[PDB]
Symmetry: C3
Subunit: 376 residues, 3 copies
């Protein structure tokens, strides 16, 4: 395409530095003999190592769109460009123009090119993968609706790359954003809007409704959970592993005996918008095929679950906004705050530094662990 063509040009540059004196002006070249051929073999093995490493670490599609320019890949592209153009200029001005008759020096120049390309590959993987390993900072990520918070540890990243790592961990650690679990407090606040220090005294002696409503709601959730467990066990017990039928029709056969209890449990825990009937039938046939217990079937539906269990059009990644005060290409430091705003919520992330820890030693004699039975 584009980058493959430039990679082909960089890969064929040392070979083109080799092949041109045995093509253009053969009648003048001194015989290299056994000096040149071992250099050719070493060049071939180093080009093979470079091709295998380049395929291993750089033949992959990009994974994110970052706001500003990525600094280190730009530095690597400028370095490779100046490097290859400088070698082509030195080959064209001195070697190819004046027709430098010793072929040994041209082969050694090409071997030095292949060596420096190998060290460019090493510097590339150092700048892109090894500087971020040693944990220098910690990050607190708080979602600004339910308050759920996680800590992470990162090295020397930029604000872009740290935000990308936080967004990687969001779909894995945090539960899915449920807007129906939040209206019960907003309706309560708008009910308080219908009607300072002295009023706060009359509030705490005036029969808290919230405790009894939470207790009654937890009792209803546990009762619906118990009836769901009974219905799913007595529904799974109706099929035998061996009329012969595929697992989709077996799921369709055992589903109408568990359907209404599951619908009532999804309504009582406010999860009815995440699970269609086709999703439940696909997961049911999945658990039927793999040979799973009814609790292994129900574990997807009992809890809230993380963001990436669900359908691909329910979680969304193509609209994230990075609110920050400084430039996002700057590295992390102690005491900065940046916000990852989604369409309805936000992840407030603040960074602290891992402190300077001083260790020392004690020399405890191991025979001092002998003691008595006196009343302590």
């Amino acid at each position: 395409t584009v980058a493959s063509f430039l990679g082909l040009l960089v890969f064929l540059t040392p070979i083109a530095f080799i092949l041109l004196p045995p093509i253009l002006w053969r009648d003048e070249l001194e015989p290299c003999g056994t000096i040149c051929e071992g250099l050719f073999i070493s060049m071939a093995f180093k080009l093979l190592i470079l091709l295998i490493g380049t395929w291993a670490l750089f033949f992959r599609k990009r994974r994110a769109d970052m706001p500003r320019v990525f600094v280190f890949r730009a530095l690597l592209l400028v370095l490779i460009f100046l490097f290859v153009v400088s070698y082509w200029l030195f080959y064209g001005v001195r070697i190819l123009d004046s027709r430098d008759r010793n072929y040994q020096g041209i082969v050694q120049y090409a071997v030095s090119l292949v060596d420096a390309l190998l060290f460019i590959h090493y510097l590339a993987i150092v700048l892109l993968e090894l500087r971020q390993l040693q944990p220098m900072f910690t990050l607190q990520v708080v979602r600004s609706t339910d308050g759920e918070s996680r800590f992470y540890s990162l090295g020397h990243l930029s604000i872009q790359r740290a935000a990308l790592v936080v967004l990687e961990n969001y779909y894995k650690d945090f539960t899915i954003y449920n807007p129906n679990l939040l209206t019960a407090s907003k309706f309560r606040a708008a009910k308080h809007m219908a009607g300072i220090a002295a009023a706060a005294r009359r509030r705490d002696s005036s029969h808290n409704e919230l405790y009894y409503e939470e207790a009654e709601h937890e009792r209803r959730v546990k009762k619906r959970k118990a009836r769901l467990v009974v219905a799913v066990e007595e529904a799974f017990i109706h099929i035998q592993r061996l009329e012969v039928m595929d697992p989709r029709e077996a799921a369709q056969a055992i589903f109408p005996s568990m359907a209404r209890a599951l619908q009532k449990y999804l309504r009582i825990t406010r999860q009815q918008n995440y699970h269609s009937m086709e999703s439940i039938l696909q997961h049911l046939a999945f658990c039927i095929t793999n040979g799973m217990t009814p609790k292994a079937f129900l574990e997807r539906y009992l809890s809230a679950g993380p963001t990436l269990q669900y359908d691909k059009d329910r979680w969304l990644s193509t609209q994230w906004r990075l609110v920050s005060d400084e430039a996002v290409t700057n590295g992390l430091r102690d005491g900065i705050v940046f916000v990852l705003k989604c369409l309805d919520f936000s992840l407030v992330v603040n960074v602290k530094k891992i402190p300077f820890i001083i260790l020392s030693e004690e020399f405890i004699d191991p025979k001092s662990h002998k003691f008595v039975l006196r009343l302590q």
Copy 2:
């Protein structure tokens, strides 16, 4: 042994390329002088670096037996074999046969060998340790008895290596498989086997036993836990840190005042098969020696605990089976399912891909956070 002998041959190959013209046919060699000696010193430092790195990253026992052939170590062994045999053939056909009189070229050939061996070591650690760092995929691992599930993040691994990482995390994250916590549902299902849409209506209006049995069982567990805490505190209070006695006899002295309450708590939570009396005495003497609180002693027994707290003959690793549809040497991709079957359960693992995330920016003026006290 075997691999140490081949490593010794690879390490002594450049030195043998050096030493043979100053042994066999000394009377013909031109004087190298100061050109050769700096190359000898650079060769010695590069061999020292190669030996230290080889000891640092490859002198260790293998950790797993994988079903099919490992692809990357086979590629590295084929690469090293073809490399060393090609250099021995080029040394024997051209240099040693024709007796190439310039010793400088032979020393430069050996230095090129040591350089290419260093880049082979670099390519080895790239293929074995650096390609798996960047998280490309996520994995859902569900145990098919109680439904307990974990998410993990992996890079470009094969199905073998991903299964090995899942089995690493199983002994650390998941609680131990307890078959006695599962018979209460199978007996209930077999009781339902003693005797579709209309029958599901009569079930949900017919006095759920499961909720009241769970509530009564939780009350009994909390009462036995309270009496266990009282017994363990009043048992630990009978010894003083200072008849002088070692911690084993102190554990034997304070154990008969906590033994029956611990036995009743292990029976009520169905953990009596995991903890013998000798295990409890060893852990008791451990917590006595290190100076730990009674709750620090009881935390091993209150919860279920992960798989690797227990005895080595209770968790088992020499029988795992990898059920998969495609070849297990293939890399991970989006939407595949593979099963790790143990002797009594299974880990169903399905792989999803981390999505393409698009970040953008907002430019919020920091003086817009000034606002009013009007009724919202």
Copy 3:
């Protein structure tokens, strides 16, 4: 300073090996021509790569004080010292003394120096960052007051570096040490000290106070939590995002309507020593500025929270003591125990080895998942 001056000397050593024959004794040097100049260009690019990599991975302040000497950095410093002193001795005894007239060999000697310095940098990052990646051991860390325990996975570290990783994870995973949550058991033990097998029988039939005290305390905590949620919602509802006022004065305006309920909740959960009024006002203005819900404000105060949320003078890192039996520079192995003693508690850490896992395969026909509706 000191290390920057030595790094400048190491960086200027190859350039000083280059520049001295074109300064001291110019009248004798043979013309290098086009052989030397490509070596100069390759030398310049390799020095640039070395400088960028050295800045990327070694220009940072040290993060910890370890008890004994660090082995691998000492090995790297001895290696660099012997390397640079050996090249200066070989340059002074042979090249500079005898005035070696071929400048090509001197330039090749300098290029070999730059190559071996690049491999020294590679060996440095291998010994310091890559050997610890592959998980060989697991670690159980138990805090010896409340019993809270975590498992971690580490590679081939020393006891110093493993203790540093455990202390990194302590401020992130473990909740903060609260000494007021521990006196209720010590007062109970001292009450039992006011007054063996037969006495343990009379205890378990004598009205456990602890269960009813825990149930009543949990009821009081839930009631104070409910009134706190009501007070914080009706306090946040009194401001509108738009007299115009900054968020500090908005926090001061809405704080006296939530203050007493928060004070009662911090007293009932024994957290009144961690949160001053200024900390609550700063966090309140933080959540007001970022636009967070009242539950997002309260999540800092509802739970106990990890160690590093709080003030820098509350958690302490400059007094940790490493109690161990063997030398702390030794590597990890299976079955060792070391203790990290803080001023009032201790982390007992014991190390187990990740077991040798044997995988095999099953070949299940995918058409065997067709089955019947017979009564199981």
